[PDB]
Short mmCIF file of C-alpha atoms in Angstrom, two decimals:
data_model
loop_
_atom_site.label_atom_id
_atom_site.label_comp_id
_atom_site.label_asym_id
_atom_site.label_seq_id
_atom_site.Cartn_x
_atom_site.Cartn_y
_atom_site.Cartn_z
CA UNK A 1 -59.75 -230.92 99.95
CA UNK A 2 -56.85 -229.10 98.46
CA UNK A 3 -54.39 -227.24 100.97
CA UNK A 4 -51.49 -225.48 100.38
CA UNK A 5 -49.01 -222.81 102.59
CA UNK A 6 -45.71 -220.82 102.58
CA UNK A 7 -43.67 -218.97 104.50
CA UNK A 8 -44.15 -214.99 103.01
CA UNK A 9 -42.21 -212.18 104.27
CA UNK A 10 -41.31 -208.73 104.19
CA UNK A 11 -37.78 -207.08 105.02
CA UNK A 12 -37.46 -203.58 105.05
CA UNK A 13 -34.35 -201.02 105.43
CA UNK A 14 -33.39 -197.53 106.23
CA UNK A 15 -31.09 -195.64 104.27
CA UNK A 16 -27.82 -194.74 106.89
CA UNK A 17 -27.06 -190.68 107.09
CA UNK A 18 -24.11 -191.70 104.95
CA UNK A 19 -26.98 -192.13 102.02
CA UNK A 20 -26.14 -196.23 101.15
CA UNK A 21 -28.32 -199.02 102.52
CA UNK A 22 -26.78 -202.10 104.32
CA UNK A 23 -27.98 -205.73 104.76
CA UNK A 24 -26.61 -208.62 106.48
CA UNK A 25 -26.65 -212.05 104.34
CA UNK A 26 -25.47 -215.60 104.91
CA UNK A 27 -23.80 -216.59 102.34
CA UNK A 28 -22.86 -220.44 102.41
CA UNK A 29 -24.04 -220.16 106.07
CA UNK A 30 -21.45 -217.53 107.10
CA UNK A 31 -22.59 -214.24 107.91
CA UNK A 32 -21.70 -211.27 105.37
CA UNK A 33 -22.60 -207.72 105.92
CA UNK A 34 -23.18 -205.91 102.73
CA UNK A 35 -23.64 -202.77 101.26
CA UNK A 36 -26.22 -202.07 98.63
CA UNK A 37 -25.04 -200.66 95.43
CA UNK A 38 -27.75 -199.61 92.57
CA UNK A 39 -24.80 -199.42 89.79
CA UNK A 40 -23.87 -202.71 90.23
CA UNK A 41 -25.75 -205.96 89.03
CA UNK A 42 -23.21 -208.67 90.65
CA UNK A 43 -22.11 -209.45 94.50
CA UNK A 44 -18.63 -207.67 94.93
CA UNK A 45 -16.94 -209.56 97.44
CA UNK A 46 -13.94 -208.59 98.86
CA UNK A 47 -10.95 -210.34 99.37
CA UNK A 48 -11.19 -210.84 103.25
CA UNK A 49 -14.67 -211.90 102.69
CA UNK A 50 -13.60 -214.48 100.17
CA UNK A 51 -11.40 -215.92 102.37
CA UNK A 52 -13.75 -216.35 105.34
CA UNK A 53 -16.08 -218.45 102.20
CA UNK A 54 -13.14 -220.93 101.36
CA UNK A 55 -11.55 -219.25 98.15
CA UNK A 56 -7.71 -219.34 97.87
CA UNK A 57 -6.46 -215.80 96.77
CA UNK A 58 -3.25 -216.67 95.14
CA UNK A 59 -5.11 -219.44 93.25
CA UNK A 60 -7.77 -217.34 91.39
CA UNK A 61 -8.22 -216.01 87.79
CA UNK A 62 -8.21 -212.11 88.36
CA UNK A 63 -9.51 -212.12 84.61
CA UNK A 64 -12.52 -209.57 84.19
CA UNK A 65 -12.89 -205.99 84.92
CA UNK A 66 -15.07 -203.43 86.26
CA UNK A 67 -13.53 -200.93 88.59
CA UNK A 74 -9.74 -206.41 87.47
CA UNK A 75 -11.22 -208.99 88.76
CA UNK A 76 -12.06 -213.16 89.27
CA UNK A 77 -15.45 -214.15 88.78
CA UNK A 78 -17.17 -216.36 91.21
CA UNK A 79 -20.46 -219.00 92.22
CA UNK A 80 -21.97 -218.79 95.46
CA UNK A 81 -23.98 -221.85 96.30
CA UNK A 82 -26.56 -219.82 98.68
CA UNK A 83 -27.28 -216.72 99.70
CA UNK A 84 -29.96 -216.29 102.54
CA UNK A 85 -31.73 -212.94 103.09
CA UNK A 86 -34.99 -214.12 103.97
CA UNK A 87 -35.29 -217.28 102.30
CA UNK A 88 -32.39 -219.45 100.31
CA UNK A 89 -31.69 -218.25 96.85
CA UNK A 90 -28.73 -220.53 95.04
CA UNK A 91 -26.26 -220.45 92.34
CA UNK A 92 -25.98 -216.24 92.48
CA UNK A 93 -22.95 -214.44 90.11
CA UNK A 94 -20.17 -212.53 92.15
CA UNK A 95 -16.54 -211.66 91.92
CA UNK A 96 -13.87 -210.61 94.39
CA UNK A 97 -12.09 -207.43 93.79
CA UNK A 99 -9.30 -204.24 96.31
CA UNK A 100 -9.44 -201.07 98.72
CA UNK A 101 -13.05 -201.93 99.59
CA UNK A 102 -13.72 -202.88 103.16
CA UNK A 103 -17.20 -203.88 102.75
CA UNK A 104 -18.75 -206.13 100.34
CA UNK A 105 -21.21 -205.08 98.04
CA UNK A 106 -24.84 -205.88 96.85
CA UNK A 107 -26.14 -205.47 93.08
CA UNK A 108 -29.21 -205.14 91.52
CA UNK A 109 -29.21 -209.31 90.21
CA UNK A 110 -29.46 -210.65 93.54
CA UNK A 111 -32.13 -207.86 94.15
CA UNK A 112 -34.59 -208.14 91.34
CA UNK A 113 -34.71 -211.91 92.28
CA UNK A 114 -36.96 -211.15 94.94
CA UNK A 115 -41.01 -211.56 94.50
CA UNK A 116 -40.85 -207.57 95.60
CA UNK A 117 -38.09 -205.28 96.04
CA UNK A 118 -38.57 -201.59 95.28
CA UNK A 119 -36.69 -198.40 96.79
CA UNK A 120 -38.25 -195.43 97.59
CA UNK A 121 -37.45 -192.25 99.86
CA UNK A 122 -34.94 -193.71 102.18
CA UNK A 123 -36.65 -196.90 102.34
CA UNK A 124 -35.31 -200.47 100.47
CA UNK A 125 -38.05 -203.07 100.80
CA UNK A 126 -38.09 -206.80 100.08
CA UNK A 127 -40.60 -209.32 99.83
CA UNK A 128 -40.64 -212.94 99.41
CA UNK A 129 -41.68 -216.30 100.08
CA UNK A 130 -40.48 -219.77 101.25
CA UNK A 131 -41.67 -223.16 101.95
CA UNK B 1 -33.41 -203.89 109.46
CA UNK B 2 -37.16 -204.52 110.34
CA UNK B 3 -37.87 -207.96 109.25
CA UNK B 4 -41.23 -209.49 109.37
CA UNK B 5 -43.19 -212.82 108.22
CA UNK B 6 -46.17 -215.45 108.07
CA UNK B 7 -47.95 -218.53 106.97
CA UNK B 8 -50.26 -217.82 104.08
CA UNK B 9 -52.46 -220.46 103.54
CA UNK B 10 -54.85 -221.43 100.29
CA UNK B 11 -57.74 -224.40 100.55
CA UNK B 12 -59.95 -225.36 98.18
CA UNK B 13 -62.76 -227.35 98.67
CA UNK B 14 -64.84 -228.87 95.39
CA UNK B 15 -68.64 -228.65 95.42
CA UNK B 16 -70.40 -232.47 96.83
CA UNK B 17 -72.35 -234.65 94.59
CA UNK B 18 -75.29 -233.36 96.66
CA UNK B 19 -74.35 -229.38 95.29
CA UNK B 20 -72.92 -228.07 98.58
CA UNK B 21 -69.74 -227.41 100.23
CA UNK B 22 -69.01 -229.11 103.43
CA UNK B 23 -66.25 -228.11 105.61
CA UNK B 24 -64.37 -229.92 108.46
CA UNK B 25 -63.27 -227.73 111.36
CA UNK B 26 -61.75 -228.29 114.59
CA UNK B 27 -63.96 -226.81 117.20
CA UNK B 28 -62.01 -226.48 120.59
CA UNK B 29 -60.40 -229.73 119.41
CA UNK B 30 -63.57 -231.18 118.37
CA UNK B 31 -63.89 -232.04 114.79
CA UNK B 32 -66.66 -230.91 113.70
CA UNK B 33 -68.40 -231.24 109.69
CA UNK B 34 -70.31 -227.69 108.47
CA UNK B 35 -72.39 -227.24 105.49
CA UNK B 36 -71.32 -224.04 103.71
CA UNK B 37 -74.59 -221.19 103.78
CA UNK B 38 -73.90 -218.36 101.54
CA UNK B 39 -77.32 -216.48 103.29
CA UNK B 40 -76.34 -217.19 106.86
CA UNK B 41 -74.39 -214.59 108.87
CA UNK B 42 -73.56 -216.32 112.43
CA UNK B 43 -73.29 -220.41 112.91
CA UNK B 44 -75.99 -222.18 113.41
CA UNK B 45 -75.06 -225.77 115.55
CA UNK B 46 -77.48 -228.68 116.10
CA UNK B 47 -78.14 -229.68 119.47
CA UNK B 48 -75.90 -232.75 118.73
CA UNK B 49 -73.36 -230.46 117.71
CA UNK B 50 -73.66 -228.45 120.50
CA UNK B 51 -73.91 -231.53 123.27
CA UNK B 52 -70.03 -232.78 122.00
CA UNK B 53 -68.83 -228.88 122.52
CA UNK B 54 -69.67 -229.20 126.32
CA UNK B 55 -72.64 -226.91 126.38
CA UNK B 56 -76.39 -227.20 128.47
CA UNK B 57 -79.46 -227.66 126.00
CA UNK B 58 -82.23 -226.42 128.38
CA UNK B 59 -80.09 -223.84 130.42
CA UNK B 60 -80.03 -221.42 127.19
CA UNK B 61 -81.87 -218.75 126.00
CA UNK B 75 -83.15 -219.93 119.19
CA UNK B 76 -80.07 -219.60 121.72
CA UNK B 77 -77.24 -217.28 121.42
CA UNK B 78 -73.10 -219.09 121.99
CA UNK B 79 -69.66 -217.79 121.45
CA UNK B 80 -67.32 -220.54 120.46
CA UNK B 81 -63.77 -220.26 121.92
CA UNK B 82 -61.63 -221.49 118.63
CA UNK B 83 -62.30 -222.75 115.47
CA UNK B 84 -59.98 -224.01 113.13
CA UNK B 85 -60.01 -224.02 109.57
CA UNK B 86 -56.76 -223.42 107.92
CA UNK B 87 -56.27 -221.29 110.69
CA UNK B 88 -57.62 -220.63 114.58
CA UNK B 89 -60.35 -218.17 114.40
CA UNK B 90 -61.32 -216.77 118.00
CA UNK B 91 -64.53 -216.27 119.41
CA UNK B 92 -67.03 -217.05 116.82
CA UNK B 93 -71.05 -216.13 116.62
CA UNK B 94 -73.54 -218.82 116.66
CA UNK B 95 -77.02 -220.42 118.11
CA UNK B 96 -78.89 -223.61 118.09
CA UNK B 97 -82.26 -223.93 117.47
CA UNK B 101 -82.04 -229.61 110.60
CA UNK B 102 -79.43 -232.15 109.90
CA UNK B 103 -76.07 -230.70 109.70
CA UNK B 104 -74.24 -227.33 111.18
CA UNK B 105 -74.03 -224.37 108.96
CA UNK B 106 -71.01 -221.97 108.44
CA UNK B 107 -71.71 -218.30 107.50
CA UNK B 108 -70.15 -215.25 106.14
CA UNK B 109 -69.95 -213.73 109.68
CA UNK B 110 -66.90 -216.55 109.69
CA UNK B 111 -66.22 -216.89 106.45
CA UNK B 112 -65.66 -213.01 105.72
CA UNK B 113 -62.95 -213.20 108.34
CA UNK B 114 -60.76 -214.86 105.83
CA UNK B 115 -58.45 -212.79 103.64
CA UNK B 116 -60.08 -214.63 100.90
CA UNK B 117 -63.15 -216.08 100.40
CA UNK B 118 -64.76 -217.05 96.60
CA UNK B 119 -66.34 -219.63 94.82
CA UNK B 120 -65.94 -220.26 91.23
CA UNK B 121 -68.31 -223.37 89.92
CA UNK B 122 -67.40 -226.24 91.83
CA UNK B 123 -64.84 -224.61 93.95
CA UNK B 124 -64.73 -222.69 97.23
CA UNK B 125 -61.52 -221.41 97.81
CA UNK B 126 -60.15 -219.99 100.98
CA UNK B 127 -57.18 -217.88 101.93
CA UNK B 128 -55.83 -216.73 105.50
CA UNK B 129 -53.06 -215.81 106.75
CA UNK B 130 -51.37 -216.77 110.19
CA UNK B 131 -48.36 -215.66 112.00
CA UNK C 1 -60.03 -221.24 84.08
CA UNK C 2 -61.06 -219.98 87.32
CA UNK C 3 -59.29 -216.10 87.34
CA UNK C 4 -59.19 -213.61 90.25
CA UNK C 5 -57.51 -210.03 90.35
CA UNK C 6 -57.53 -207.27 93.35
CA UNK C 7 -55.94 -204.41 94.18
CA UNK C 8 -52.86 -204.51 96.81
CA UNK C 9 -51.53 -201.29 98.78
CA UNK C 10 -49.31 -200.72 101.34
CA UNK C 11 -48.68 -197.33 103.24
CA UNK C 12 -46.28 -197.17 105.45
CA UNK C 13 -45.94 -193.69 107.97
CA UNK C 14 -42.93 -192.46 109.96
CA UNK C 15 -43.59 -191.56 113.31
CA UNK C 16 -43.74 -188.32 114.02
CA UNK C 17 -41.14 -186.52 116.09
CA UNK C 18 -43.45 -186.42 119.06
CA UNK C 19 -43.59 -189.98 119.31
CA UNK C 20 -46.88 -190.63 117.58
CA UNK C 21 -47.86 -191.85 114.92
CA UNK C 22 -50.74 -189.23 112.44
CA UNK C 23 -52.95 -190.49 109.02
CA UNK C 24 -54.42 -188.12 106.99
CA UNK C 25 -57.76 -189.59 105.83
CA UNK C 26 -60.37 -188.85 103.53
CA UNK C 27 -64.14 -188.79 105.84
CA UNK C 28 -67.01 -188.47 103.75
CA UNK C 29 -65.01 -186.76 101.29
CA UNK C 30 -63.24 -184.46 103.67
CA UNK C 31 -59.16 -184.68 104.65
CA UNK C 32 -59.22 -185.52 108.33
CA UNK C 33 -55.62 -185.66 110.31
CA UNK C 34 -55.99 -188.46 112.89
CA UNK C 35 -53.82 -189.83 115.29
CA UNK C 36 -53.24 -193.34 115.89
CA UNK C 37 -54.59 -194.57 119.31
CA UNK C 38 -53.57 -198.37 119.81
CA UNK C 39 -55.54 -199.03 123.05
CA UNK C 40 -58.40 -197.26 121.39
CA UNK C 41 -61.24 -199.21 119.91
CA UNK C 42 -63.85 -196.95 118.18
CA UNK C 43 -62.97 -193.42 116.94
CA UNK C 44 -62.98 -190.51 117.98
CA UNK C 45 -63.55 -187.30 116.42
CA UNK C 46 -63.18 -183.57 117.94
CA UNK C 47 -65.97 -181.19 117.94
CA UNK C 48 -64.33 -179.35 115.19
CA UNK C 49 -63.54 -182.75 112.77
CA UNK C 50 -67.38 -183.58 113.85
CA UNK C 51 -68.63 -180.22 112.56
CA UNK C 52 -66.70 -180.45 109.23
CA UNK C 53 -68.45 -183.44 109.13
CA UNK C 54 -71.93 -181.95 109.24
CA UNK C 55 -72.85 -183.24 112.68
CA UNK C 56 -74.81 -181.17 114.81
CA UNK C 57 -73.90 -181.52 118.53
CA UNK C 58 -76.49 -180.60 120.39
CA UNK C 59 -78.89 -182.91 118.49
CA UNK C 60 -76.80 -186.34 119.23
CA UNK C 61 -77.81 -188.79 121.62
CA UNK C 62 -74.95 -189.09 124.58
CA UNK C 63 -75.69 -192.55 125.50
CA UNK C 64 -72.17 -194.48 125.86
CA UNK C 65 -70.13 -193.47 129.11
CA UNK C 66 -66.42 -193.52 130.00
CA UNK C 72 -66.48 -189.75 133.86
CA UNK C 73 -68.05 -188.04 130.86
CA UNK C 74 -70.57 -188.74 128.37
CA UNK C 75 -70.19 -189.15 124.48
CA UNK C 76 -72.49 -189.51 121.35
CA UNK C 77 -71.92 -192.37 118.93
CA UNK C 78 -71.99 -191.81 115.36
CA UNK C 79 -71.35 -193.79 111.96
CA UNK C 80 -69.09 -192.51 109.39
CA UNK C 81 -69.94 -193.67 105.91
CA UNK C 82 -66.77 -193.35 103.96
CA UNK C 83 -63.45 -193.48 105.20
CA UNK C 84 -60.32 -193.89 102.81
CA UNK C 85 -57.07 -194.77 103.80
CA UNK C 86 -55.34 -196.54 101.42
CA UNK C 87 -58.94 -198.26 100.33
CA UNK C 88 -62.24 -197.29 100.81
CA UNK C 89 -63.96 -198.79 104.03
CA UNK C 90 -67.93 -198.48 105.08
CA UNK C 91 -69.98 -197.88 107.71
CA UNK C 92 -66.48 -197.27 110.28
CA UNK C 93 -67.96 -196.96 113.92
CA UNK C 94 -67.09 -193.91 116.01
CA UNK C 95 -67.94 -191.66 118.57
CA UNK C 96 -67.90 -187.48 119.53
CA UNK C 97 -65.03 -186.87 122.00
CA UNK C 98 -64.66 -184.21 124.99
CA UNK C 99 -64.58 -180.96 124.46
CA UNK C 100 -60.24 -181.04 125.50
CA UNK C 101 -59.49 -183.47 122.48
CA UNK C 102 -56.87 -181.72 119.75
CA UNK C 103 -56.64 -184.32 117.45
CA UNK C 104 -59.05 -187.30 116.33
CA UNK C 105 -58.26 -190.59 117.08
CA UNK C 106 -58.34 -193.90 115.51
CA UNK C 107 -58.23 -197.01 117.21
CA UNK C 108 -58.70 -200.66 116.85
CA UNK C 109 -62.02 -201.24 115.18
CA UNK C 110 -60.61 -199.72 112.20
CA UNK C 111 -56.88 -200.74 111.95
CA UNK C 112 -58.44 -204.62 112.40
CA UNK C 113 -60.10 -204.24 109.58
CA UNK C 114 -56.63 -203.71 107.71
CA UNK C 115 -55.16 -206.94 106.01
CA UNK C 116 -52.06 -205.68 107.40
CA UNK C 117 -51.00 -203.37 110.16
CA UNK C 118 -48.10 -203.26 112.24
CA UNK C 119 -45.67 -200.86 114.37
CA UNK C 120 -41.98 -201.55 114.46
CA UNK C 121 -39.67 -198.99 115.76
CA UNK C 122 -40.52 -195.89 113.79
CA UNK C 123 -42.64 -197.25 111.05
CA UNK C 124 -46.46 -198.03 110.90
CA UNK C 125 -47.05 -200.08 107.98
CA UNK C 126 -50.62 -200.46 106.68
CA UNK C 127 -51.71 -203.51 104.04
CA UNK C 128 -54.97 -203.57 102.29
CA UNK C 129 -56.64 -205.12 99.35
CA UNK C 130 -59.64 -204.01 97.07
CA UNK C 131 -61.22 -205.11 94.00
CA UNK D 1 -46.21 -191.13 103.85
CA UNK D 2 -45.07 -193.78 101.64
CA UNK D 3 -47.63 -195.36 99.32
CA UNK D 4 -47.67 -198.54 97.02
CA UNK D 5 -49.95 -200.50 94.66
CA UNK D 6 -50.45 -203.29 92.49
CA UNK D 7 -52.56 -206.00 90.90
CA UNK D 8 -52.12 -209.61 91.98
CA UNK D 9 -53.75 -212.15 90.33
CA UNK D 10 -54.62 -216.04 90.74
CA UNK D 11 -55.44 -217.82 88.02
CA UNK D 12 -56.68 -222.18 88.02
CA UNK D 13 -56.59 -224.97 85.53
CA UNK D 14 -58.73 -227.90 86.45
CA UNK D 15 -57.26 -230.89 84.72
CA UNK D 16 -58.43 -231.69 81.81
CA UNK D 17 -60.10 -235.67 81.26
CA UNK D 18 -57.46 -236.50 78.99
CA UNK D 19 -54.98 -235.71 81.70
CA UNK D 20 -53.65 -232.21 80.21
CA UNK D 21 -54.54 -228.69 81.34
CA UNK D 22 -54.98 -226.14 78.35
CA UNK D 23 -54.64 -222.61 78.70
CA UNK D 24 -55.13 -219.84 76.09
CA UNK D 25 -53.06 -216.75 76.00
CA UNK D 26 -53.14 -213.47 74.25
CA UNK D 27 -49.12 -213.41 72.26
CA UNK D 28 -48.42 -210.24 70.34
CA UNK D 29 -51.97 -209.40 70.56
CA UNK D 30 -53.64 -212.81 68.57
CA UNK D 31 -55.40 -215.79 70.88
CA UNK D 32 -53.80 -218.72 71.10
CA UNK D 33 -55.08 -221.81 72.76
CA UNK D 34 -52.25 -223.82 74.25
CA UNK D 35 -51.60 -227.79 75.70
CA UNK D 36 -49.46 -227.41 78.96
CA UNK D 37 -46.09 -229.64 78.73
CA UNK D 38 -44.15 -229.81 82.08
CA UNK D 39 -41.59 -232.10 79.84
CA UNK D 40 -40.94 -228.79 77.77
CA UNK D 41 -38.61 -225.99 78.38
CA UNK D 42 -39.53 -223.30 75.73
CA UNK D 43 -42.65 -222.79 74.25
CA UNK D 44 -43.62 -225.13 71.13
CA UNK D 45 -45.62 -223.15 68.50
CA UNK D 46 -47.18 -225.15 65.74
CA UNK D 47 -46.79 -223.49 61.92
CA UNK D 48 -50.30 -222.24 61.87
CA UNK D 49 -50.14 -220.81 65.17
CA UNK D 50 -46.42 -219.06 63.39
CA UNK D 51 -48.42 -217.72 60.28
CA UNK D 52 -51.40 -216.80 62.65
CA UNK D 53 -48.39 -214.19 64.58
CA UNK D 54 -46.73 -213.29 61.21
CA UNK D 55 -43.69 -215.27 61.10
CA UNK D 56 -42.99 -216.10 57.66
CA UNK D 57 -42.39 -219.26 57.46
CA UNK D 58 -40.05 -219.90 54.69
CA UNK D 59 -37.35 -217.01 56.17
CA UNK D 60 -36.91 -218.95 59.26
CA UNK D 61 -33.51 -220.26 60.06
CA UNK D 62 -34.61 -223.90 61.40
CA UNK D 63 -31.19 -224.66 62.92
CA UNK D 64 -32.77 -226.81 65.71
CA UNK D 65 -33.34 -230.60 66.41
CA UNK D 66 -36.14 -231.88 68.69
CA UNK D 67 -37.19 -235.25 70.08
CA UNK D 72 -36.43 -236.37 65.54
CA UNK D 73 -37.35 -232.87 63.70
CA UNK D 74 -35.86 -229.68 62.83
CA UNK D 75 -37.21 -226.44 63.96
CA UNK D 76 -36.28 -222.87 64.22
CA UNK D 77 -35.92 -220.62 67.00
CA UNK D 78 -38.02 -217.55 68.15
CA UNK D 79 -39.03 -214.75 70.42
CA UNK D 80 -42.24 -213.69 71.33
CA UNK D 81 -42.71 -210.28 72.31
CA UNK D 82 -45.13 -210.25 74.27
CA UNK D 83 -47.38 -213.07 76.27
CA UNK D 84 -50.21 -212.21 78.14
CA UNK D 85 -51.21 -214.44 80.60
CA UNK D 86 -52.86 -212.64 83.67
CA UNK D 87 -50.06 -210.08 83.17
CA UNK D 88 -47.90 -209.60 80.57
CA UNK D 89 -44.52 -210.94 80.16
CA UNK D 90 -41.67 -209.74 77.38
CA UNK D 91 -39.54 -212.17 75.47
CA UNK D 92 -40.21 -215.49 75.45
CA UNK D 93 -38.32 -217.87 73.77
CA UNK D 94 -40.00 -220.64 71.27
CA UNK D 95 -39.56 -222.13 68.20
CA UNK D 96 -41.86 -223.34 65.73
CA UNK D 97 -41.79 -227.24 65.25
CA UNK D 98 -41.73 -229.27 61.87
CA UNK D 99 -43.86 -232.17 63.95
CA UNK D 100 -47.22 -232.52 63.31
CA UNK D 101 -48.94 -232.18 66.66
CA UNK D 102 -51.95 -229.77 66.59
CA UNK D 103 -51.50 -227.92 69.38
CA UNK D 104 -48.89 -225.75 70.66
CA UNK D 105 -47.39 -226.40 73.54
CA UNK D 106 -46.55 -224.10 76.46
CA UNK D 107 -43.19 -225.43 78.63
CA UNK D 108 -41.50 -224.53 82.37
CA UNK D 109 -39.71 -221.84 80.68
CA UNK D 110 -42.62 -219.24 81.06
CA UNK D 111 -44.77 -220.81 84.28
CA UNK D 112 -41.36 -220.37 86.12
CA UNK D 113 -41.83 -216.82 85.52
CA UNK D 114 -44.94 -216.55 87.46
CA UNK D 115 -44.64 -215.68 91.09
CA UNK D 116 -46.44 -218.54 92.04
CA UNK D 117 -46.38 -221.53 90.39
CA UNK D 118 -48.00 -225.20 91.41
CA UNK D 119 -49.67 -228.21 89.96
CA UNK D 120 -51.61 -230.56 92.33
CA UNK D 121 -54.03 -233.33 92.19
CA UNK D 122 -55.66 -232.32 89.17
CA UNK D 123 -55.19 -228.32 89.56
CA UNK D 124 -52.73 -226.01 88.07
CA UNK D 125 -52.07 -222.63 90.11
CA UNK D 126 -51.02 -219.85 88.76
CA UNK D 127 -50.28 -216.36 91.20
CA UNK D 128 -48.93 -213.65 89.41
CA UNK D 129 -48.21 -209.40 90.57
CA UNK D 130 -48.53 -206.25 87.72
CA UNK D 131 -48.88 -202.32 88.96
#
C-alpha cells in the first residue's frame, strides 16, 4: 500500500493601474517586495535591499553590466515554497527590487495573461 | 495577491494473491477492511460490519445507511450504503468521488485532493 | 509501464461590475448566459433560456415547491470548460432575468473557488 | 473570461526482478529501450544505439573519461518521454555494456519525479 502527498498551490496576481505586477518574497527569511520585470532574467536587488540581506556595499565587485553591477547568490527565496541557490545582482536609482524571468520559469506553472500573473507549484 | 493551496494525495494499492483489491478505511474511527467492486454503486456492509459502526440490525428497513466519514486518503462525508457474504464492498458511488480513480493490471491507483 | 494522460483547464471570470459573478455556457448546443448563484443547488433556467431549449411549458410536470411551483428538467449537455452530462435543473418563475447556476453543478468542478473578484474554475477531461 | 489548457501525464515503472526499471523512449524520432541509472548524471548511449540516431561514429571528438573509458559528448534533440523535452546532454561510451543508460539529468526535468518500494513515478505537463 503505496502512499504519497504534497503540498500544491496556486498564487495569482493583478497587474497595478501603473501596468507592472508586484510580489512579496522572503528571501533568506527577510521579507522583499518586488517588482516583476519580463526583460529581465536575474533578481535586481537594490542596494538598500542588499544591505537588509547581510552584503557589505563598499566590499563588493561592481564588475558586470546591464543597465554596472556585482553579481550575487541567494541561498532561498520563498514565494510559495523554498527555491535555493537563485542568480541576482545589486545595482542604483531603483527603489524597488526587481523580479526576472529565471526565478519565474522555475515554477511547475507560471504564465501571464491579460492583467493576470499566475504561479503554480508544489512542496513537501 | 490571491494565494491558495492543498494536499494532493496518490495511493496505490497492488491486486491480492486472491485477484482483488482490498482497501482499509477508517469508518467514524473504525477501521474497517473493503473489497474493491467495480459493478457496485453504493457500499454494501455486513451485519458484523455494521454492529462495530453502532447501528440496530432488526430496527432497519436490504437496508438503506448513510455513513458519517470515511477515510481513505482523505475524509469523505456522508457515504451510501446497506446491509443485507464475507467481506464489505466499496463502489464507484465512493470511489468516483476521487479526483482519480484507475486500475492498470495489478494496480488500483487513487488520487484526492484535500485542503 | 502503466501511462495516463487527461486534459486540464482552468477558467477563471472577473466579477462583474454589479457584484456578480456571469458564465456563458454552451446547453445542448446553445450559448446560455448564467449567473452564478452560491446558495443555489439545482439550476435554474428562465422561460425564455427554457424555450431556446425546446421545452414546452405548459406540458411540464410542476411537482417540486419553494410559495410557487416549478417543473424539473434534465439538461443533457452542458460545457463549461468540459463537457458535463445529465446536469439537474429546474424551470424558474416567470420574474427571473437571468438563469442561475448553483451548487450541484459547480461541485462537480475539480476546482472552484471565489476570492475577491475572481471565480476560478478547474476541470479535467480525457 | 480567461481560459487555460494542458495535458498532464503520469507515467509508472514497476521494478524490474533484476532490481532495475527500464524505460523506452522515442529520441530524434528512433525507439530506444533504456536501463534507468540513478548513479548517472547524463544519459549513457551505447555505439549502436549512436549509429541507430546517425552519429557517425568515427567524427566524434571522445574527449571524455568515465568510471576507466573514453567517450565523447552529445546532444540529443529531442526525447520523448510522455512529453517531449529539447537538448539533452549524453555521450556515447567506449564500455561494453548493452544497454544505454538513462541518468538524473533528464528525470529531474519531469515535474514529478519519485522512486519507491519498487515503483518509479513519473508526472509530467505539455499544452
Amino acid at each position: 500500500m503505496y502512499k504519497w502527498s504534497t503540498e500544491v498551490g496556486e498564487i495569482i496576481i493583478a497587474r497595478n493601474r501603473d501596468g507592472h505586477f508586484y510580489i512579496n518574497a522572503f528571501v533568506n527569511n527577510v521579507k522583499i517586495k518586488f517588482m516583476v520585470d519580463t526583460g529581465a532574467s536575474d533578481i535586481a536587488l537594490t542596494k538598500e535591499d542588499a544591505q537588509k540581506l547581510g552584503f557589505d556595499l563598499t566590499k563588493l565587485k561592481y564588475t558586470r553590466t546591464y543597465l554596472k553591477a556585482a553579481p550575487i547568490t541567494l541561498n532561498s527565496v520563498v514565494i510559495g515554497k523554498e527555491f535555493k541557490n537563485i542568480k541576482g545582482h545589486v545595482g542604483g536609482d531603483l527603489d524597488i527590487s526587481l523580479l526576472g524571468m529565471s526565478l519565474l520559469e522555475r515554477f511547475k506553472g507560471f504564465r501571464i495573461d491579460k492583467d493576470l500573473l499566475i504561479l503554480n507549484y508544489a512542496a513537501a
